[PDB]
Structure 1
Amino acid sequence: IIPEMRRVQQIHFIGIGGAGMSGIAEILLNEGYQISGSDIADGVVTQRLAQAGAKIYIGHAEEHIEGASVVVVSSAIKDDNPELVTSKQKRIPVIQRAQMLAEIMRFRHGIAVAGTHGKTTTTAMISMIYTQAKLDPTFVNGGLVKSAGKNAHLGASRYLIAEADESDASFLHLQPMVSVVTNMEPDHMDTYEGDFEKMKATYVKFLHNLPFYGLAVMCADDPVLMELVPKVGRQVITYGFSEQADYRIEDYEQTGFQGHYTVICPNNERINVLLNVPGKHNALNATAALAVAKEEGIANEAILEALADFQGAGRRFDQLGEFIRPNGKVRLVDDYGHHPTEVGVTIKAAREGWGDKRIVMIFQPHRYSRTRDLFDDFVQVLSQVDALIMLDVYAAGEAPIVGADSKSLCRSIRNLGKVDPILVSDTSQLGDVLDQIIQDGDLILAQGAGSVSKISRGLAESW
């Protein structure tokens, strides 16, 4: 094996239950490091880590860092966190989540997946292709890979597939061999001082982390990405529906919640793809995945097998089941989409699978900052469903911003006159409210990045 990180005996994670944090912790646990961590919440993730031998503390206290050789910190952690403050006082190395991810990547063949939307999905897809190819990859995904039942896996090969978060610009730590950029739209704009040009510059800097011989795989259908190509200074391979795409998608058809399409490769090789998840957005994600795999020299059959049986990522167009309600049989689908674009493509994918029956949405806005920044776009997109239940903003640690709450969204949606939303501030009433507005054959989308998935789970179990 590769020698242990020098003098690193115990790695302490502040926010260890995190989607990215937990996977990093699990990789290192399985490499033989002592793992400790704290989290304000105990759930399936922390329980799994504890059962595997991680020392897990619920709630934060300065004593929890005892023994730590290094402290890894989620960007969710406040500056005045007692563990964080004490670590700095005691001069224990304190590093970002992504810096520890970078260390996992350092001596590996890193395939980093960046972009505004679809990172978790694309990472899961590449992970499954490489697994299918018998390449035994390590992966660290920012979400549950359904065919793994977990977010991360330690393989014995040198491959690492990893999701690369731009939200705090922390992906600049990463030194990959191949970098995917799925798309670029304004999100997390506070980090970039509301300046989209600073986000662009940051992604260019990220791509400049590639070695001179490294590969950037970028969506041809994104005009921002295409504008940036001259700045990359590394080989760029593109994918998408665009006539100019190196890996070009043609003849896309969605049947039910499966996609069918052809991909045309740079050497004019034609590959007929069956994708086990719906929507053109997922065809894009899967073509990023196919492009990476083809450029790596992976055979078609492995790519196609993995895509045809792709079970998805948790919470990403995730079918929870069918339920017989007093007013009809309904389908409950959970989706992580939290940016207007994501909500949009999800609605469209649902429409192309359902057809005659209604799309009912339970939407929980994530962040006041995001609601403020993209208010008008949310109003437009949320008006495209047939029935809309609005939940209160999931604060995600943010103080309320005036005019950027669910009541304000409801008022503005109501003004458009396409749908009349019902605000459900008391989620214990959600079941009763739904049952009143449910019709036979409804597809219910539980939509958002916050506690909406927990709420939909509790709703599904009660049903």
Structure 2
Amino acid sequence: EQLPPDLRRVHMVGIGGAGMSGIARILLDRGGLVSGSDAKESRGVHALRARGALIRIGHDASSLDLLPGGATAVVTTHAAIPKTNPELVEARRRGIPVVLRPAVLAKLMAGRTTLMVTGTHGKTTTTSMLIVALQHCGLDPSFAVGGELGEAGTNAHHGSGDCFVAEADESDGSLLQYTPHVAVITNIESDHLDFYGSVEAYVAVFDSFVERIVPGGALVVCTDDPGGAALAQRATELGIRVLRYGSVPGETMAATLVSWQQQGVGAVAHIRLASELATAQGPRVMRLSVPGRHMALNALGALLAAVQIGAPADEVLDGLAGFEGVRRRFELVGTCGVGKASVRVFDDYAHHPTEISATLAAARMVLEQGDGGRCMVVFQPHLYSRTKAFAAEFGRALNAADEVFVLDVYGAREQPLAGVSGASVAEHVTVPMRYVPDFSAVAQQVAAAASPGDVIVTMGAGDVTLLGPEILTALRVRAN
């Protein structure tokens, strides 16, 4: 019905980021005044300026005079903006509150039925599936999706509905700012510990989050994941409603993946829903337009979340059938040639060994619908520390491909470690492999190694996504 007083005139430091931009859009659509600052001009800055936001390029204290009567709050994000930023200093000097993005999002979600999706990976896809399912059922939920894949998949919308669907980051402690009515948890793996220092504290963030669920709420949780299954048990012992989904049958399972197959038109799964949800007809068929069995598991999570707020299961399944995937999630970049002899180039954000194995299994199942292609992966390791810790597991996961090109480590503002490179991963791969540390040489080499019917996947969380188009060009030039 209203914005809280602290959110009426908001100045956003780093407003050009996709998450900050979505928050600013929602603020504006609910009658807020927004000013901001960013290091670099971009299309998001232009769009926000066009909607009435006063945005200065570059950070400077004067930006705090843009709003009439001064800013009621300054919104930053600790991951991107340092505490030594001039505008944060000026804000603390005048006594203007400084908040992080998740607190603002929590204030925006207040008064709605909130569906939060978290987990180590698969958050963006599951949140997007849930949003698409709800919209297919005629609803107009508010939402804020994105984060896990960087800018990819990030979007936000102020809706007329009573629901608010949000992706919750678990890598920086944002989880604990939220109060979910329905909490979905895709998995809990031993990663993203850089903020927590230990597996134990990271796992504990999820227990605290589960405790934050409103009375009478529900936790949808994947139980094929070990951390997820343990957390589901712990949550059941707290008295909380627990909707489990996975592949192992059980009396305490809300939804079960009985079978899954990849076909030429798309994927098809057979599932069993608990009799409490939906109807007595036992086995349901769930078709999907996205490849991969793990996508069917994600879809089960979104389905249970949607049913919890009163959407009919069959119509939700219809809506999930039309989900097309998000950017950098086995995303088709392009095709060279036609039919069975065509070479397809895909893009994927996978950077955890489980993600790598899942993506390569999906690629192999896609290949099995063709007539004899090969799977070539172009993998860019994501961090020096991650590479040093996980190189053996990375190479083991990459062994699922027919050919592997390994790029050098993408640093991502991390301090370089002596003795660590992409070759640290390349040492552990058993299948045909090439180490290509020169970025500009990659595309050509891949184009030379391609055969008709091949599936090519650029994989990684950094620069590697830019190689998809180039490869295609280098393939079409090769077509003489």
Fold equivalence (TM over 0.5) = yes
Distance 1:253 1:156 in 2: 38
Deviation track 1:132-173 (CA, whole Å, cap 9, x = no partner) reads 11121011100699xx99612211112000000000011110
SS at match of 2:95: coil
Q: Quick one: which amino acid aligns to residue 71 of structure 1?
A: V
User: Counterparts of 2:191 and 2:36 in 1: how far apart (Å)?
Assistant: 29
Check 1:277–1:404 CA distance in 2 against 1; reply closer, same or farther (3 A cut).
same
Matched-pair identity in %: 37
The alpha-carbon distance between structure 1 residues 173 and 150, as it changes in their structure 2 partners (threshold 3 A), is closer
After superposition, where does 1:208-219 map in structure 2 within 5 Å? 208-219=211-222
CA displacement, residues 423-463 of structure 1 (integer Å, 9 cap, x when unaligned): 233x3333322222222222111112223223434555786
Q: Say whether the 8 Å CA contact 2:153–2:326 is kept in structure 1.
A: no
Match of 1:263 among 260, 271, 278: 271
Instruction: Give the whole-Å Cα distance in 1 for the aligned partners of 2:374 and 2:274.
Output: 41
Q: In structure 2, list runs of 5 or more residues that go unmatched.
A: none
Say if 2:75 is the partner of 1:72.
Answer: yes
Note closer, same or farther for the CA distance 1:175–1:164 as it changes in structure 2 (3 Å cut). same
Q: Who is 2:190 aligned against?
A: 186
Partner residue of 1:165 out of 169, 173, 183: 169
The amino acid across from 1:318 in the alignment is E
Match of 1:116 among 102, 105, 120: 120
Q: How many residues align?
A: 453
Report the secondary structure of 2:209's partner residue. Answer: helix
* One-letter amino acid of the structure 2 residue matched with residue 357 of structure 1: G
1-structure distance, mates of 2:466, 2:63: 28
Deviation at 1:112, TM superposition (A): 0.2
Report the counterpart of residue 444 of structure 1 in structure 2. 456
Shift of 1:422: 2.5
Structure 1 distance, partners of 2:55, 2:325, is 29
Q: 1:261 to 1:406 in 2, by over 3 A?
A: same
Q: Which residue of 2 aligns with 1:385?
A: 401
CA distance in 1, matches of 2:195, 2:31: 35
User: Residues 359-409 of structure 1: CA distance to partner in whole angstroms, max 9, x if unpaired?
Assistant: 222222222232233232112112332222233322222221234432332
**Alignment of structure 1 residues 50-449 onto 2, 5 Å:** 50-66=49-65, 67=67, 68-74=71-77, 75-142=79-146, 151-193=155-197, 195-232=198-235, 233=238, 234-244=240-250, 245-256=253-264, 258-267=266-275, 268-269=280-281, 270-324=283-337, 329-355=342-368, 356-410=372-426, 412-413=427-428, 416-425=429-438, 427-449=439-461
Q: 1:324 to 1:449 in 2, by over 3 A?
A: same
> Would you say the 8 A contact 1:113–1:181 is kept in 2?
yes
Q: Decide whether aligned partners of structure 1 residues 150 and 373 sit closer, same or farther in structure 2, where only a CA change above 3 A counts.
A: closer
Aligned partner letter, 2:263:
T
Q: Distance in 1 between the 2:148 and 2:471 partners?
A: 21
CA distance in structure 1 between the partners assigned to 2:41 and 2:48 by the alignment: 11
For 1:56-87, what per-residue CA distance to the aligned partner results, in whole angstroms no more than 9, with x for missing partners? 44443343444333222222323333333333
Q: Partner amino acid for 1:49?
A: L
Displacement of 1:211:
1.2
Q: Can you list the C-alpha shifts for 1:190-214, whole angstroms capped at 9, x where unaligned? A: 2121x21211211000111101211
> Which is worse superposed, 117-126 or 90-99?
90-99
Bigger radius of gyration = 2
- TM-score of the two chains, using structure 2 as the length reference: 0.87
Judged with a 3 Å threshold, the aligned counterparts in structure 2 of structure 1 residues 84 and 446 are, in CA distance, closer, same or farther, namely farther
1:10 corresponding residue in structure 2 = 9
CA distance in 2, matches of 1:63, 1:344: 50
RMSD in angstroms over aligned alpha carbons? 2.5
Which shows bigger deviation, 12-21 or 232-241? 12-21
Measure the CA separation in 2 of the matches of 1:84 and 1:366.
30
Tell me whether 280-289 or 17-26 shows the greater mean CA deviation: 17-26
TM-score (norm 1): 0.90
The amino acid of 1:239's aligned partner reads: Y
- 8 Å CA contact retained: 1:143, 1:151: no
Q: Secondary structure at the match of 1:112?
A: strand
The 1:54/1:271 distance shift into structure 2, 3 A limit, reads farther
Contact 2:146 2:154 in 1 (8 A): no
CA, structure 1 residues 35+450, in 2 after alignment: closer, same or farther (shift >3 Å)? farther
Asked whether the 8 Å contact 1:389–1:424 carries over to 2, the reply is: no
The answer (yes or no) to whether the contact 2:443–2:467 under 8 Å persists in 1 is: no
SS in 2 for 1:161: strand
Task: Tell whether the 8 Å contact from 1:188 to 1:370 is kept in structure 2 after alignment.
Answer: no
Give, as a single letter, the amino acid of the residue that structure 2 aligns with 1:20. G
The alignment partner of 1:213 has SS state of coil
- Alpha-carbon distance between aligned partners in 1 of 2:126 and 2:288, rounded to the nearest angstrom: 13
Give the partner amino acid of 1:240: G
Greater Cα shift, 331-340 or 291-300: 291-300
Decide whether aligned partners of structure 1 residues 76 and 338 sit closer, same or farther in structure 2, where only a CA change above 3 A counts.
farther
Deviates more, 1:349-358 or 1:299-308: 299-308
- The C-alpha deviation readout for 1:12-55, integer Å capped at 9, x for no partner, is 33333334323222222222323333344444444443443333
8 Å CA contact 2:175–2:205 kept in 1: the answer is no
Distance 1:5 1:461 in 2: 52
Q: Measure, in 2, the Cα distance between the counterparts of 1:95 and 1:401.
A: 34
CA distance in 2 between partners of 1:96 and 1:133 (Å): 33
Q: Secondary structure at the residue paired with 1:166?
A: coil
Deviates more, 1:447-456 or 1:347-356: 447-456
Name the SS of the counterpart of 2:135 in structure 1.
Answer: helix
Q: Secondary structure at the match of 2:287?
A: strand
